[PDB]
Amino acid sequence: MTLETTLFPLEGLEGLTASYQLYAVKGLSGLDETEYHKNVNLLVRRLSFSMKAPFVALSRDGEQFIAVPNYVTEFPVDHRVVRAMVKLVPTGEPLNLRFDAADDEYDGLRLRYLDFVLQQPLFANHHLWQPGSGQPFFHKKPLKRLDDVDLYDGVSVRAAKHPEGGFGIVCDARSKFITHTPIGARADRKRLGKLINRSCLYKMGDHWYQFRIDAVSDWKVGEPSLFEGNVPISLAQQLVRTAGNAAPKSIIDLDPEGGALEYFTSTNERRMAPAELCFLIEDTHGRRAAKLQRQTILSPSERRARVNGFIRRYLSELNIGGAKLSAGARAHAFFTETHMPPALSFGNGTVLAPDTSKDRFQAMQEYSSMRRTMMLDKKVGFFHQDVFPPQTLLLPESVKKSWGPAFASDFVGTVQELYPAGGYRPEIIEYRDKAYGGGVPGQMKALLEVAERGEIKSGDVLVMLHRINGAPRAQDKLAAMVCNEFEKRFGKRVQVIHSDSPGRGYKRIFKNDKPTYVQQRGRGVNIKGYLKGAALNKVCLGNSRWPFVLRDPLNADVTIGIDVKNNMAVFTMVAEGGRIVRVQRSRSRQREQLLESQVTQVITEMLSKELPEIKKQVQRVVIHRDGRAWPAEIAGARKTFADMAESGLIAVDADVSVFEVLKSSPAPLRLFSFEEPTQENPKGVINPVLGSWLKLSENDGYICTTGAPLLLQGTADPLHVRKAFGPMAIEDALKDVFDLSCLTWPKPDSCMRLPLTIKLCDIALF
């Protein structure tokens, strides 16, 4: 019950002046929304870099408001580029922010100043470096060698509210992989062309930083490519002109014939960097280098050790205006009650409840196992049991002619054993996967023409696609294409599997003097496991046959997940206790953001259909956003529900709350609990228990949706949720985030870090 954080308190901030002066930006007041905030955050960075002061943006009312420190002297007030010229009219009332104070709306302002000053000792340490603004600091010396790629260890350091009052520091260990040798001066023009969009570490003498390769320069390092006052100057000459004092040999003795790269500054200037000084960052999720990935998974005691070691070594001294701000040696620790997993309802009126008489750890593991075994027991089974509507299995022709039939036979039987009530009996159809070209167009040509023939009787289809590109850090545009077209022109609900992984499970055999495909089970896939998993996710879940639901009400009557990536939005809606789940995709006019009118359309459309099956009057709605919530999205959700409270579809005093679900947290914190130290674990640090949680603030909490009994390796990564709007108390949102993440439908005997609401969003996009 004893949990330690990676929160370290900050002392000697006791009544420290932080003085600001609000300005407001007239700009180009046309708000393209996504474009409006790119430029806002563009100017704050440009202004911050040029005057070396903590400029911030405060989005309330007009969403402008750049906060200028009172201590800056000359201030341009007018700023060029940015299309139409911008003007900043000061809003008076200079704010002297205290750090001993209660919660303000200027706490975002206070956290930014605190953030800015905290990285000055770090940015000045010659032995550390930072990839870009806002990122962790890494040691210049690599931790580990790993045979042509280097492993660098870093620590993110972010300011945050302390739940006992005042301010503190949250940290986490990070790893970055960089190839050991540079690109090199001798690498030729064609090889350099092949690196566009990759990112490399640039050791520009003592200033190390990261950039993205945008183009290859027409000019080598020693040929004049720009000018320092009219006169043409080589890149080699430029690095000499901007070196200091005892510049390293490496930056003044560059091969004149080496090539140079070009990149854009975080203010969009173009710069060059010599390939002799550039080191490719190894995207290991792009190229499966898993022995590399293994070096990155740290035990809880390693992770704790690296963070505490870092704290005591680099944030020990910090003089800001003389002030002596110490980071305490003791991370914040507290006693808390841990959420028990919720009672669950299965088929045949059977509930699964955590056993409160066994000890917590043994009870959680029995519980987690029982979600699978109850789901599979023909005596209890799925909560929702019914015949499937007609189904279709759409296979490539090359597959129907080889192992398709054995796979389909095995697959149907797997569905019927997992979900006996369904009577899965799919029509098996094919498309001419070799008639048109095997790229995305051509695969799609054959698919549309099967559709156009009307060969997909039935509204549900499971179609087997070929993998076009691998690289798990890619976009499978074929799958999205098939769903967009099959949903939009025909009435199809489509689920996707690929042909490579099941195909590895079958080998051809000669039996009774006839070729046959039979399962194999050496190395490559576990075909039985694949068959069970695909049966649950593609057939059962794809027909909304939920295996189990919450027995008890969440704090919210309805929670809606929202993710938008790559101009495609997903809305999931969970009501009852997961008894009612709906997922709508919709195209988006911006890459990662939604128009207000679009939010209000999709949600009233989705909810209106479902309201007659929500048999309790609705009075709490929650929205879970993946990442940042945008003001136009909030307006659409408050408008949607204020409307329904007036129609009578919902309680006249219903309320909305908006929470950002930060699967990639901007302020990542760890939680540990403790154990007897034991040879193998000299400090006795273990993962936190499954339901552990911590709030820092009314707006910021963390729940271990993953944790002690149920993790295989590594240390639990607490899910950061941040309150964007609304009455609901942050503690309540964390509790039913936890309860929603116990609906582990894609893999019941496992833990699941995301609540079901936004997990369904990642599934629908991925």
Residue numbers in the entry: 1 to 766
Sentences from the paper on this structure:
To elucidate the mechanism of guide DNA binding and cleavage site selection by the newly identified D-R pAgos, we determined 3D structures of apo-form PliAgo and of its complex with 5’-phosphorylated guide DNA (P-gDNA, 18 nt long), either in the absence or in the presence of Mg2+. The structure of PliAgo was determined by single wavelength anomalous dispersion (SAD) method with SeMet labeled protein at 3.28 Å resolution followed by extending the final resolution to 3.1 Å with a native crystal. All crystals were formed at nearly identical crystallization conditions and belonged to the same space group, containing one PliAgo or PliAgo-DNA complex per asymmetric unit. A crescent-shaped PliAgo molecule contains the N-terminal-L1-PAZ domains on one side and the L2-MID-PIWI domains on the other side, similar to other eAgos and pAgos such as TtAgo. In contrast, the C-terminal 18–20 residues of PliAgo are disordered in all the structures indicating that the C-terminus is located away from the 5’-end binding pocket and does not interact with guide DNA.
Here, we describe a new class of pAgos that uniquely use DNA guides to process RNA targets. The biochemical and structural analysis of Pseudooceanicola lipolyticus pAgo (PliAgo) reveals an unusual organization of the guide binding pocket that does not rely on divalent cations and the canonical set of contacts for 5’-end interactions. Unconventional interactions of PliAgo with the 5’-phosphate of guide DNA define its new position within pAgo and shift the site of target RNA cleavage in comparison with known Argonautes.
